[PDB]
Every structure is written in structure tokens, then in C-alpha cells.
């Protein structure tokens, strides 16, 4: 449950450190 909420919240500001985007 906490994992689900964490994924939901982090999706708002998630940025990948790999360039270019796959």
C-alpha cells in the first residue's frame, strides 16, 4: 500500500538520468 502510494506520488516528478530518453 505504501509502495503503491510512493509510485503514484513519485510519478509526478520522476526524471530519468539516462539521455537520450529510450
Amino acid at each position, epitope marked *: 500500500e505504501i509502495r503503491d502510494k510512493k509510485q503514484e506520488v513519485r510519478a*509526478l516528478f520522476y526524471r530519468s538520468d539516462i539521455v537520450p530518453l529510450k
Partner: antibody, heavy 123, light 107 residues
Framework: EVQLVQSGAEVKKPGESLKISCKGS????????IGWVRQVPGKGLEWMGI????????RYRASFQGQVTISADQSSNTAYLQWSSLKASDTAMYYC????????????????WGQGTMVTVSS | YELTQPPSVSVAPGTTATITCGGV??????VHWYQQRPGQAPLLVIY???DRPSGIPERFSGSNSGNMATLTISRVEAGDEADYYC??????????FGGGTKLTVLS
């Protein structure tokens, strides 16, 4: 250690432009958001905007859109908050803060703060 | 969206200090708590509701559910006197801080 060092206090007049800076050291600058927060002395914290230095994505609080611009320098690891035309109501302390990029390996919060830059606007 | 905090809270030393953060469905997001002493920059004391950063003593704890989140300081000490702010990332472009709470440890 990881730290953010901000530029010195400023005294400016209404209508003038201003650029304050936030130098990051001890960590990989491109992989963390940098947010700017305003605090009028004696008052609470107000979020202004945030930039991801890895590519320059910026997000702003609606009320601050059009008044300030946030930018970043990937060679000097420096974030910037910039006013084109200052107002008297811009007098405040301004903090920069590092925020994780949304992965479990980092803290997804403002875990490192700068010491603050005091800006006074008076004619 | 608004986060509601009590403007001031006073507690006897050694007792449990409780600071609440009021938001609609705030239990469906993650709440973070920052400490600020006069003249100093904020300091992260709790993140992801119940997680402590390194260097923060274990007496600090947090919870979050329904329409309220809570910062709890057990065996509160004089050194904990300070302002406390809750914070959430509500939407893409919305990052919100609570109004802040001045915690006084009655001396």
C-alpha cells in the same frame, strides 16, 4: 559534503533586474531538482518554482509565472533565480533546495537547503 | 489546495509533542516535515510520512492517513523548540508548504 551555497545579500530598487545564484557541490548536479522558496521575514515558506538541471525543465507556481525565471549552468553547477522588474513586495529571504528525482535510492524531499539570500527592494 | 497547521503549539519538556497538518485526502500522498530555527535554513526531519534522514534522532516520528498527517516528537527537549512546516507535492506544478507551527518547549 553535499551543500548549496547561495550568493550574498542584495539591496535593489523597484523596477531593476536581479539574479541570485545557488552553487551545488559534493553531488551530481544534473540528477536532482533545484527548487526556490520565498520566506518574508516572520512569515512562512512559499514555493516559487523548480528546475531539473539535467535538461532545464522548469515548473512554477502560477502566481510567480511571468515575474521570475529559473535557469541552470551545467558547467559551474549553479542554479539561478532572476527578476526582470523587481517590486517592493519582493523583499524576502530566498532559499534554494535540492529535491530527489523520484527514485527509491534518493530522498524525495528537500533534503539539502542553501543558507538563504536576503533581498531588500526599496526606492 | 491548502495545508492547515496550528500557528503555535506549546508542550512541557519530556512529554510528546504533536503537530498536525490538515489537507483534503492528504493520506493519499506523501508528507514531509522540515524544522527551522530562527535565523537558520530549514532542515528536513521527516520524509515519506514516517522516514527519518540520517542525523535526526529517533524520537522524531510521523504518520499520515485520512485527512490528517502528524509529526510526533517523543520526550521533547528544549533543543526541539522551533518552527515546523509540512510539505507535499500535490500536482505536476504544485508544491505546497503548510503555514508553519511554532513549537515552544515550556521553560
Amino acid at each position: 559534503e553535499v551543500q548549496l551555497v547561495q550568493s550574498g545579500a542584495e539591496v535593489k530598487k523597484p523596477g531593476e533586474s536581479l539574479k541570485i545564484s545557488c552553487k551545488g557541490s559534493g553531488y551530481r548536479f544534473p540528477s536532482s531538482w533545484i527548487g526556490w522558496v520565498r520566506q518574508v521575514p516572520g512569515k512562512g515558506l512559499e514555493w516559487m518554482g523548480i528546475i531539473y538541471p539535467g535538461d532545464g525543465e522548469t515548473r512554477y507556481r502560477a502566481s510567480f509565472q511571468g515575474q521570475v525565471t529559473i535557469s541552470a549552468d551545467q558547467s559551474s553547477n549553479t542554479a539561478y533565480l532572476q527578476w526582470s522588474s523587481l517590486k517592493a513586495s519582493d523583499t524576502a529571504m530566498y532559499y534554494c533546495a535540492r529535491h530527489g528525482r523520484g527514485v527509491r535510492e534518493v530522498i524525495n524531499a528537500f533534503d539539502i537547503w542553501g543558507q538563504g539570500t536576503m533581498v531588500t527592494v526599496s526606492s | 489546495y491548502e495545508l492547515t497547521q496550528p500557528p503555535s503549539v506549546s508542550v512541557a519538556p519530556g512529554t510528546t509533542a504533536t503537530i498536525t497538518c490538515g489537507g483534503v485526502d492528504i493520506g493519499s500522498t506523501l508528507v514531509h516535515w522540515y524544522q527551522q530555527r530562527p535565523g537558520q535554513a530549514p532542515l528536513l526531519v521527516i520524509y515519506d510520512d514516517s522516514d527519518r534522514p540520517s542525523g535526526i534522532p529517533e524520537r522524531f516520528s510521523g504518520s499520515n492517513s485520512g485527512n490528517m498527517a502528524t509529526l510526533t516528537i517523543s520526550r521533547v527537549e528544549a533543543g526541539d523548540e522551533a518552527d515546523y512546516y509540512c510539505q507535499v507535492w500535490h500536482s505536476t506544478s504544485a508544491v505546497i508548504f503548510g503555514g508553519g507551527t511554532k513549537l515552544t518547549v515550556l521553560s
